[PDB]
Design a protein around this ligand. Structure first.
Ligand code: CA
Ligand code: CL
Ligand code: CL
Ligand code: NA
Length: 321
């Protein structure tokens, strides 16, 4: 069986086209080039994945139309069997579980994704959360914070490096601070009285269903408000652009409201994020995202049914680390 390999420049351009035509901006993670790409037999869909131990671990649901996603999942099962490897899907949506169920996988809760409904979102709405946001926006501007947007390839790289350096690659589920990769994206920069203090690359598609985040890095010496200001600014930006939803990203299990007495399928997923003698607890991450009144949806780890998931969990942990 032919060797699993990283994509070439041409394959990446094909992925990019597919992402643009999709409603799944998070497919942009493919563009780092550190994940193998499995293309649907029409180049209208793709699945991205990496190998760790005897697991082949896909990142997210496949990118593309519904039928092609379902077909790529069966393809991937075949491909894993061909390589004597177990299939694993990292961070997938509930609506696709029946497809994973059909290729013989069960699922473990991994965490929850926060998405803002941009249509219903409004700073003048009732409640304390909006009041606090209105304060952040005004105070922020009063204090010399300003958000700017750059078309792909136009952000001043060397000013980004400064920020990125102070704030510090894990890969797979994360973007890479490289020109090659960042050149694919619109980039937002927060300046404090002219000085760059945070940035974020923006994951979009040609449609306005969904925009989301990849790298978001703030200077350690930036004003405390900087990260909230940036996020609020992005939400306001995409609301104004006519986008429907904006994704704030996932909070893993241990960062959610605790649930002892919960069955193991809703607990074992924490094993993906261990830090020495301790689980990553992601303190405050959930609280921060909740500032924007998102909606929350579970994300799952799909793993072989009937078999002890510890080994798939170990492989996923190594991959994510
Ligand atoms: Ca299996
Ligand atoms: Cl007010
Ligand atoms: Cl546009
Ligand atoms: Na088809």
């Amino acid at each position: 069986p032919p060797a699993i390999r990283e994509p070439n420049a041409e394959e990446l351009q094909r992925a990019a086209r597919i992402i643009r035509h999709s409603d799944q901006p998070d497919g942009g993670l493919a563009l780092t080039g550190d994940k193998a790409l499995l293309f649907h037999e029409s180049d209208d869909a793709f699945l991205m994945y990496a190998r760790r131990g005897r697991s082949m671990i896909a990142l997210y649901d496949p990118i593309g139309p519904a039928m092609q996603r379902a077909e790529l999942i069966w393809q991937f099962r075949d491909l894993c069997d061909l390589h004597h490897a177990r299939p694993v899907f990292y961070q997938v949506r509930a609506e696709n579980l029946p497809f994973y169920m059909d290729i013989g996988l069960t699922a473990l809760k991994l965490g929850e994704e926060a998405r803002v409904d941009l249509l219903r979102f409004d700073l003048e709405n009732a409640g304390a959360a909006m009041k606090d946001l209105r304060y952040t926006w005004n105070r922020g501007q009063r204090d010399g914070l300003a958000l700017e947007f750059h078309e792909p390839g136009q952000a001043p790289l060397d000013e980004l490096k400064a920020i990125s350096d102070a704030w510090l690659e894990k890969g797979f589920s994360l973007g890479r601070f490289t020109p090659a990769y960042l050149n694919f994206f619109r980039i937002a920069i927060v300046r404090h009285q002219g000085k760059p203090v945070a940035f974020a690359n923006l994951l979009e598609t040609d449609s306005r269903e969904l925009a989301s985040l990849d790298l978001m890095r703030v200077h350690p010496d930036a004003p405390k408000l900087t990260m909230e200001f940036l996020m609020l600014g992005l939400i306001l930006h995409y609301k104004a652009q006519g986008h429907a939803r904006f994704s704030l990203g996932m909070v893993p299990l241990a960062g959610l409201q605790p649930r002892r007495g919960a069955p193991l399928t809703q607990r074992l997923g924490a094993l993906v994020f261990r830090r020495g003698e301790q689980f990553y607890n992601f303190q405050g991450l959930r609280r921060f995202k909740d500032k924007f009144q998102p909606d929350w949806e579970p994300r799952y780890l799909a793993v072989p049914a009937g078999l002890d998931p510890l080994v798939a969990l170990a492989d996923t942990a190594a991959l994510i680390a």
